[PDB]
Design a protein around this ligand. Sequence first.
Ligand SMILES: O=c1nc2n(c3cccc(Cl)c13)-c1cc(C3CCNCC3)ccc1C21CCCCC1
Ligand SMILES: [Zn+2]
Length: 111
Amino acid sequence: PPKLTKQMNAIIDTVINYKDSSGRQLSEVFIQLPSRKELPEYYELIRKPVDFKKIKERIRNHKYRSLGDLEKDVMLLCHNAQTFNLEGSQIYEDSIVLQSVFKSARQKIAK
Ligand SMILES: O=c1nc2n(c3cccc(Cl)c13)-c1cc(C3CCNCC3)ccc1C21CCCCC1
Ligand SMILES: [Zn+2]
């Protein structure tokens, strides 16, 4: 794979694998969106749905021109989680932590 592809895969794999001090993998709920037929209410509220599987697809298929474009999709995923899920819920808080994990992984891997 090209250098940018390896860097993006390392960044997103770091985010997906991140665990809190209890050993819980925070990305678990964000890997795969519920289907439109099972939870249409999600798609009525969230204009541009995205999950980590879709971000991995966009890295795999060379859709992100820059790390800024990848960051935009990660921040969109976290924005969608905060929009749909209750403030203070574990999912909402986890999405805030993952925004920080992404920024840290990006700085470490891309230098
Ligand atoms: O914003 C999200 N809220 C949610 N999800 C998400 C999945 C991927 C990305 C995002 Cl950004 C989300 C999400 C994902 C699931 C999966 C669907 C596939 N089978 C395993 C479970 C179930 C439920 C959800 C919520 C959280 C709980 C309330 C319903 C919606
Ligand atoms: Zn390729």
